[PDB]
C-alpha cells in the first residue's frame, strides 16, 4: 500500500506526503485513501489518529 | 413628576440636533470633462 508521513502540523490542519510524492492536507473529519477517516489531529508530538487504528507520524529520516 | 422634566430635557437635546440636520442642503456640483 501507500505510506503517508507528516510534513507539517499546526492545530487544526496537517500537511502529508506519500510514498508516491503526492501531497495532501487534512482537517479533523477527512478522508485519507487507504486509511479511512481522520479521528484526531494532535499537533503536539506529531501524531494523527485514524479510524482504522493506524497512526501517521513524522518520517524517521526526516524529523 | 421629577422624572418627567428630566425626560423632557433629554428629548430637547435630541430634537435640536435633528432639526439642524434637516436644514442643511448642499450645492450641486457640475463636472466638465474633456
Amino acid at each position: 500500500r501507500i505510506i503517508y508521513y507528516i510534513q507539517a502540523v499546526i492545530p487544526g490542519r496537517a500537511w502529508l506526503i506519500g510514498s508516491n510524492g503526492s501531497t495532501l492536507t487534512v482537517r479533523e473529519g477527512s478522508k485519507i485513501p487507504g486509511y479511512g477517516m481522520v479521528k484526531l489531529i494532535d499537533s503536539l508530538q506529531g501524531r494523527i489518529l485514524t479510524s482504522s487504528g493506524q497512526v501517521i507520524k513524522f518520517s524517521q529520516e526526516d524529523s | 413628576q421629577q422624572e418627567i422634566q428630566q425626560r423632557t430635557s433629554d428629548m430637547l437635546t435630541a430634537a435640536t440636533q435633528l432639526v439642524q440636520d434637516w436644514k442643511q442642503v448642499e450645492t450641486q456640483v457640475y463636472t466638465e470633462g474633456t
Binding site: - | E26, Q28, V29, T31, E32, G33, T34
Partner: protein, 159 residues
C-alpha cells in the same frame, strides 16, 4: 529549602495571570464579538446586472438605479445599436450622499453610496445629444445593481 518551591509557584502566577487554557477561551470570545459586529441586519441585497432602455419622450419616467452603502455601481451608456456613447459632462445633486469617479473621456460612471436611505437625482449629458438624460438613485433596496447597461434612443458617434 521548602520556601523556594513556594516562591516559585507564586511568582509564576504573578508573571502569567492567564493560563494557556484561558488564553484559548479568550480568543474565541474576541472573534465571536467581531462576527456579531460585522453581521448585517435582515438579509443582504442580491447582486445583479441589469439592462434598460431609456426613452427621451416627454411622457415616460426616468430610470431607477439601485445602490447600497459602501458598494460600487458602474453605469455604462450605449446607443440604440449597442455601440458605446461617450459622456460630455455630468451634474450631481446632493454630493454628501453619493461619490462619483470618472476619467474625463470614457463612457462609464462609477457611483458609490455614502448614506443608508437618502435618495436623489443626477444629470448626464452625452457627446452628440442636446437632451440631457435624467436618472434617480435610490439606495437600501432588496437588490443592488453591480452594472446597468443603458440603451439611449438616438445614434452616437459610433455606429
Amino acid at each position: 529549602e521548602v520556601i523556594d518551591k513556594k516562591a516559585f509557584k507564586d511568582m509564576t502566577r504573578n508573571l502569567y495571570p492567564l493560563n494557556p487554557e484561558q488564553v484559548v477561551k479568550l480568543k474565541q470570545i474576541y472573534e465571536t464579538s467581531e462576527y456579531a459586529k460585522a453581521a448585517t441586519p435582515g438579509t443582504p441585497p442580491k447582486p445583479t446586472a441589469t439592462s434598460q432602455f431609456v426613452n427621451l419622450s416627454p411622457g415616460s419616467t426616468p430610470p431607477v438605479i439601485r445602490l447600497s452603502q459602501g458598494f460600487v455601481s458602474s453605469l455604462v451608456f450605449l446607443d440604440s445599436t449597442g455601440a458605446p456613447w461617450p459622456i460630455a459632462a455630468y451634474d450631481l445633486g446632493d454630493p454628501s450622499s453619493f461619490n462619483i469617479q470618472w476619467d474625463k473621456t470614457s463612457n462609464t460612471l462609477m457611483i458609490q453610496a455614502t448614506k443608508l436611505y437618502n435618495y436623489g437625482n443626477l444629470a448626464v449629458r452625452l457627446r452628440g445629444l442636446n437632451t440631457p438624460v435624467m436618472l434617480t438613485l435610490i439606495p437600501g433596496q432588496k437588490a443592488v445593481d453591480y452594472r446597468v447597461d443603458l440603451r439611449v434612443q438616438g445614434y452616437g458617434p459610433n455606429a
